[PDB]
Amino acid sequence: QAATVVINRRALRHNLQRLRELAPASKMVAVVKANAYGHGLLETARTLPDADAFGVARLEEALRLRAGGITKPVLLLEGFFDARDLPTISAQHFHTAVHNEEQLAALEEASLDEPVTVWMKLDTGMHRLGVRPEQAEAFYHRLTQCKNVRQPVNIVSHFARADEPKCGATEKQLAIFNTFCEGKPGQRSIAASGGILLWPQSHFDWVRPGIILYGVSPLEDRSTGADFGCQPVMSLTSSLIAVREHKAGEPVGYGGTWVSERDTRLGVVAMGFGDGYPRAAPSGTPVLVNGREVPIVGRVAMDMICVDLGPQAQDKAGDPVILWGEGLPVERIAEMTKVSAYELITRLTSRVAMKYVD
Amino acid sequence: MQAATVVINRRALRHNLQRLRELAPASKMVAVVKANAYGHGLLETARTLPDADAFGVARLEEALRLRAGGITKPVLLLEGFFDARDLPTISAQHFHTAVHNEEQLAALEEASLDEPVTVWMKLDTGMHRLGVRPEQAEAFYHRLTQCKNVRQPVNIVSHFARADEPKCGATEKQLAIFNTFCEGKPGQRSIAASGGILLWPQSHFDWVRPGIILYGVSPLEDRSTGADFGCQPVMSLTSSLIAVREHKAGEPVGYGGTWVSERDTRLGVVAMGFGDGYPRAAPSGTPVLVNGREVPIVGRVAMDMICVDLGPQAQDKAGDPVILWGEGLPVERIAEMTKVSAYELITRLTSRVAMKYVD
Ligand SMILES: *Cc1c(COP(=O)(O)O)cnc(C)c1O
Ligand SMILES: *Cc1c(COP(=O)(O)O)cnc(C)c1O
């Protein structure tokens, strides 16, 4: 009963449906990269057979989905990293982003038994992956002439600042996208969680929900998944392993970073940065013990967190702890720790047990 | 082109255990391999180190994973056991257990085990995390000496809170409490982890417990490195470039457009992000090696990708090797630049990274 991630399948199902309601003329790429944002790659795909496609960061992730029996299209959002992977991508029926000359040249040169669906990736201001506007027309035209590309060619981009509604970058990216796509056949996709929730004019043909599919807000404005009618999917849980007396004036943890002002009782939780809980968490960060809120005291260690229960607290070794979950949104922990909700949910280690419910 | 990969140098690990033996040549070694061996691989790290006298783990589950992989060496449960029903298993697996609370002691008192168990009584000397407080320790100790389920002698363990701070008199106060309690008791004594081993030779006693320094990473926050102490870095975190792209002066990069280029340049995109374990806290200017040479992170680290500034006519290509930390770039340098503990950097990696073992 130590560090466990409990994944609520009913919440997942709900969220995909709730997102369809917000984007009712758009198909869904369920984004499941990085072990489905910490929720389990294969189990998340298995929970969502109504998704129109799954979205992954890397070919290895797509192959893992196929290995576990997943048959729906998988979009390689970064494309492919070696020309020698094209026969697999063709045979496996993965759709691929194409963002550079190397990938384009490989598609021109290869002999494949079946052509492949492509999403040409346009750099519209993020400046990470993608073909730049001034190179994009010639690039696109070569893609349309490739016998190894199943026509028409689709067009994809991604917003850098969709979470800042009051700033002009999204509208700039959008106008670049729209200028490029004019008169072209091919499906259009630019919106992920932020686009879906705040930019209805960015929905087009396909949207790609990631963090909000897991019932977690993409914004850092205090909002939670529930503010958009999405239900939190993950709870990170554990157990007390000690309840101990502690006297006034006595420090706790490494570096003696917290000192009690009174006599009290401390709880020790079987959870640490070796499980994925941020070492950054300050004293005062909320944890739930038997469902009431108590503060972290002293530094988070690799395997343990101390909490302040109070001097006659009746909590005991064995009792349930919620790091985030029912009553304690991950976005609250994000705000209190200054750690992005994205990183909190995703950057867990393999030590955490995975449990699925409903 | 290789994706997010941890490369674990077995030769370095073996070197480190022997180095640590040279620094504390009268003490036995508990190799501390909790949290997937500080990111290096629980079972493979233990397989690399047959010379260790024991292996230390945080939780029973980790000890059972060692036995399941065929490690037969003594394993110490540093936090003891969380359920009384664990005792038969602990007994029959020959796991050594810390004991630090009443629940554990009463469980030992009313079990009837096939074989008695080796116990290390955990004393709170001032960390105030686990252990028995001094005013309860004599009575608690006596009860262990009278328990038929405990092999005699009862051994004695504690742990330093601030051993990385020599100008602090905290460590000395811990040692005075520890020595007072151990006076005239027959068991083995163990207080020192990496910081105690390196800086406090009067803390070595019968058994020392290297964690971080075993992996060639310094336990201190003063920009010292494992090599400061003659230890060799074990882990390299590596990847490859997936794109090299033109970029213009006045142009932003990444989410929030937090870095803006002052020149026309080329950027590199690495197959590495916080989805692999690389910290999202890394600021612009954090170093990475591309083809052996240092280049800076530009813009925020993403879940799967990191952007670096290569230069206006750089010849780096998609596919080229990238070192996040490793040869020519110690994890402690990343720790300094990101303001993250080196403990966290090496340990808080996800299952996405491949594990490769060399030498
Ligand atoms: C990660 C990602 C998404 C999903 O992002 P969220 O903000 O988590 O919804 C969509 N598109 C691309 C290209 C991505 O890399
Ligand atoms: C974590 C731990 C160690 C190892 O600590 P380092 O600072 O990594 O050497 C040793 N003993 C105990 C009880 C521990 O919890």
Author numbering:
A (entry chain B): 2 to 359
B (entry chain A): 1 to 359
Task: Reproduce text from the manuscript describing this model.
In this study, we have addressed these questions by focusing on the two PLP-dependent enzymes alanine racemase (ALR) and cystathionine β-lyase (CBL). E. coli CBL is a homotetramer that catalyzes the formation of l-homocysteine from l-cystathionine. We have demonstrated that two non-homologous specialized enzymes from E. coli are as little as one mutation away from being physiologically relevant replacements for each other.
Tyr-274′ is found in the innermost part of the substrate entranceway, and it is conserved between bacterial alanine racemases. Given the location of Tyr-274′ at the entrance to the active site, it seemed likely that mutation to a smaller Phe residue was useful for allowing the new (and larger) substrate, cystathionine, to bind productively. To confirm this hypothesis, we used x-ray crystallography to solve the structures of the His6-tagged ALR(Y274F) variant and an inhibitor-bound form. As expected, the Y274F mutation had no significant effect on the overall architecture of ALR. In the wild type ALR structure, the hydroxyl group of Tyr-274′ forms a hydrogen bond (2.6 Å) with a crystallographic sulfate, and it has been proposed that this sulfate mimics the position of l-Ala on its route into the active site. Although we also observed crystallographic sulfates in the structure of ALR(Y274F), there was neither a sulfate nor a water molecule in the position equivalent to that observed in the wild type structure. One implication is that removing the ability to form the hydrogen bond (by mutating Tyr-274 to Phe) has perturbed l-Ala binding; the increased Km for l-Ala in ALR(Y274F) supports this hypothesis. Removing the side chain hydroxyl of Tyr-274′ opens a pathway toward Arg-280′, without otherwise disturbing the structure of the active site. The conservative Y274F mutation enlarged the active site pocket just enough that cystathionine could enter it and form an external aldimine with PLP. In vitro alanine racemization assays showed that ALR(Y274F) had a 1.4-fold decrease in kcat and a 1.7-fold increase in Km, compared with ALR.
